[PDB]
Design an enzyme around this catalytic site. Sequence first.
Site, PDB file in Angstrom:
ATOM      1  N   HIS A 114       0.812  -1.230   0.000  1.00 35.26           N
ATOM      2  CA  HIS A 114       0.000   0.000   0.000  1.00 35.26           C
ATOM      3  C   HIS A 114       0.840   1.273   0.000  1.00 35.26           C
ATOM      4  O   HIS A 114       0.319   2.363  -0.229  1.00 35.26           O
ATOM      5  CB  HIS A 114      -0.994   0.027   1.178  1.00 35.26           C
ATOM      6  CG  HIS A 114      -0.398  -0.276   2.518  1.00 35.26           C
ATOM      7  ND1 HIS A 114       0.145   0.696   3.332  1.00 35.26           N
ATOM      8  CD2 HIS A 114      -0.308  -1.437   3.212  1.00 35.26           C
ATOM      9  CE1 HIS A 114       0.565   0.144   4.457  1.00 35.26           C
ATOM     10  NE2 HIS A 114       0.306  -1.150   4.407  1.00 35.26           N
ATOM     11  N   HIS A 133       6.780   6.750   5.665  1.00 30.58           N
ATOM     12  CA  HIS A 133       6.236   6.287   4.400  1.00 30.58           C
ATOM     13  C   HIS A 133       5.584   7.479   3.727  1.00 30.58           C
ATOM     14  O   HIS A 133       5.511   8.573   4.320  1.00 30.58           O
ATOM     15  CB  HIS A 133       5.207   5.170   4.610  1.00 30.58           C
ATOM     16  CG  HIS A 133       4.019   5.618   5.398  1.00 30.58           C
ATOM     17  ND1 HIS A 133       3.971   5.545   6.774  1.00 30.58           N
ATOM     18  CD2 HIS A 133       2.867   6.213   5.009  1.00 30.58           C
ATOM     19  CE1 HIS A 133       2.820   6.044   7.196  1.00 30.58           C
ATOM     20  NE2 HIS A 133       2.137   6.464   6.145  1.00 30.58           N
ATOM     21  N   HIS A 163       2.291   8.911   0.856  1.00 26.76           N
ATOM     22  CA  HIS A 163       1.084   8.759   0.073  1.00 26.76           C
ATOM     23  C   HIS A 163       1.238   9.690  -1.122  1.00 26.76           C
ATOM     24  O   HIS A 163       1.704  10.814  -0.958  1.00 26.76           O
ATOM     25  CB  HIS A 163      -0.155   9.120   0.892  1.00 26.76           C
ATOM     26  CG  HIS A 163      -0.270   8.357   2.176  1.00 26.76           C
ATOM     27  ND1 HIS A 163      -1.046   7.226   2.286  1.00 26.76           N
ATOM     28  CD2 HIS A 163       0.307   8.538   3.387  1.00 26.76           C
ATOM     29  CE1 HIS A 163      -0.973   6.762   3.522  1.00 26.76           C
ATOM     30  NE2 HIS A 163      -0.137   7.524   4.206  1.00 26.76           N
ATOM     31  N   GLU A 186      -3.061  13.332   1.779  1.00 25.76           N
ATOM     32  CA  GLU A 186      -4.215  12.899   2.543  1.00 25.76           C
ATOM     33  C   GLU A 186      -4.855  14.107   3.227  1.00 25.76           C
ATOM     34  O   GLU A 186      -6.028  14.401   3.016  1.00 25.76           O
ATOM     35  CB  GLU A 186      -3.797  11.831   3.550  1.00 25.76           C
ATOM     36  CG  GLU A 186      -3.215  10.589   2.852  1.00 25.76           C
ATOM     37  CD  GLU A 186      -3.317   9.342   3.689  1.00 25.76           C
ATOM     38  OE1 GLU A 186      -2.814   9.336   4.836  1.00 25.76           O
ATOM     39  OE2 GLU A 186      -3.904   8.362   3.191  1.00 25.76           O
ATOM     40  N   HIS A 220       4.672  10.759   6.008  1.00 26.98           N
ATOM     41  CA  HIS A 220       4.275  10.483   7.377  1.00 26.98           C
ATOM     42  C   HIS A 220       5.421   9.865   8.150  1.00 26.98           C
ATOM     43  O   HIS A 220       5.882   8.768   7.807  1.00 26.98           O
ATOM     44  CB  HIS A 220       3.067   9.554   7.404  1.00 26.98           C
ATOM     45  CG  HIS A 220       1.816  10.204   6.910  1.00 26.98           C
ATOM     46  ND1 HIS A 220       0.707   9.488   6.506  1.00 26.98           N
ATOM     47  CD2 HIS A 220       1.495  11.514   6.768  1.00 26.98           C
ATOM     48  CE1 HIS A 220      -0.241  10.331   6.134  1.00 26.98           C
ATOM     49  NE2 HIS A 220       0.209  11.566   6.289  1.00 26.98           N
ATOM     50  N   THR A 223      -4.625   6.499   8.959  1.00 23.32           N
ATOM     51  CA  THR A 223      -5.359   6.717   7.715  1.00 23.32           C
ATOM     52  C   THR A 223      -5.459   5.455   6.860  1.00 23.32           C
ATOM     53  O   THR A 223      -6.037   5.487   5.775  1.00 23.32           O
ATOM     54  CB  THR A 223      -4.724   7.820   6.856  1.00 23.32           C
ATOM     55  OG1 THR A 223      -3.455   7.363   6.375  1.00 23.32           O
ATOM     56  CG2 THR A 223      -4.577   9.125   7.659  1.00 23.32           C
ATOM     57  N   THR A 224      -4.875   4.360   7.340  1.00 21.50           N
ATOM     58  CA  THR A 224      -5.066   3.048   6.730  1.00 21.50           C
ATOM     59  C   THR A 224      -5.710   2.124   7.761  1.00 21.50           C
ATOM     60  O   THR A 224      -5.589   2.362   8.977  1.00 21.50           O
ATOM     61  CB  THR A 224      -3.738   2.418   6.243  1.00 21.50           C
ATOM     62  OG1 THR A 224      -2.834   2.295   7.347  1.00 21.50           O
ATOM     63  CG2 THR A 224      -3.087   3.249   5.149  1.00 21.50           C
TER      64      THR A 224
END
Length: 257
Positions: free
Chosen positions: A61, A91, A93, A103, A116, A195-196
């Site tokens: 992801h 990580h 996004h 996000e 993040h 957020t996951t």
Amino acid sequence: HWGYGKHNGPEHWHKDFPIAKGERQSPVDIDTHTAKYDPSLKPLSVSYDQATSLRILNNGHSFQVTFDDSQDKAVLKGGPLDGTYRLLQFHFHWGSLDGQGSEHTVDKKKYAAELHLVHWNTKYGDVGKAVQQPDGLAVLGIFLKVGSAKPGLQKVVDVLDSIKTEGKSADFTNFDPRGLLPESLDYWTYPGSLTTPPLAECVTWIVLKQPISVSSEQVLKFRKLNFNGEGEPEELMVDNWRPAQPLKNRQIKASFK
Ligand SMILES: CC(=O)O[C@@H]1[C@H](O)[C@@H](O)[C@@H](CO)O[C@@H]1S(=O)(=O)N1CCC(OS(N)(=O)=O)CC1
Ligand SMILES: [Zn+2]
């Protein structure tokens, strides 16, 4: 089997993780004119000089760089936080296009990506226990826009070819995450969630006002990663972001005027 696709993406997550519709979900839109300056907020303390990076990993992801969190080596303190939070991993996004990927949003503006840096509260002893607490994690969020390259990011992007597909990992020692930080540590903060999945409501969010700039070549290398494992139909790892969730009964505080 959650993901970011039409049939398993963010609009589907609540079926396996009903907290998706909870009272303090992340990300959110940061309405800059409604955020309240809080003069009692202390400066953020980012102490990364002894950071020990270990591995870089395609987790299906995103990709993450993991750190030794068995000692206070890279810690976050101050700001809205009580106590000491150890850096576990960072990580990103990102989007399929430069106008989306973050996000959090700022006055509904989307950035090309969002970094993040994930930290957990040492009073809970391990990250698994921390994720079960309302103040268990602190995530430092940093926006990426496309423009000039970020030299401190280059060592990350140059190894992404070695972890193209889900499950692949590589040695990633002696990486200095200080090279990813903007000049200013001015921030917004609010109580939120992962957020996951499992979307646990355990995060004090600290989102920096100042984005970092990365080059078009750097973000293009993000977009060459794969959601899929090797041998499966190739699906580019892009648009791995959850959209803004309802603010509900929360106030975003700013550390700055
Ligand atoms: C590695 C990873 O992707 O997340 C796991 C996991 O999903 C979560 O249940 C918990 C269990 O170890 O935390 C880790 S994590 O600490 O490294 N992890 C990474 C992604 C999540 O970040 S996010 N996007 O809220 O900021 C936060 C938790
Ligand atoms: Zn994240």
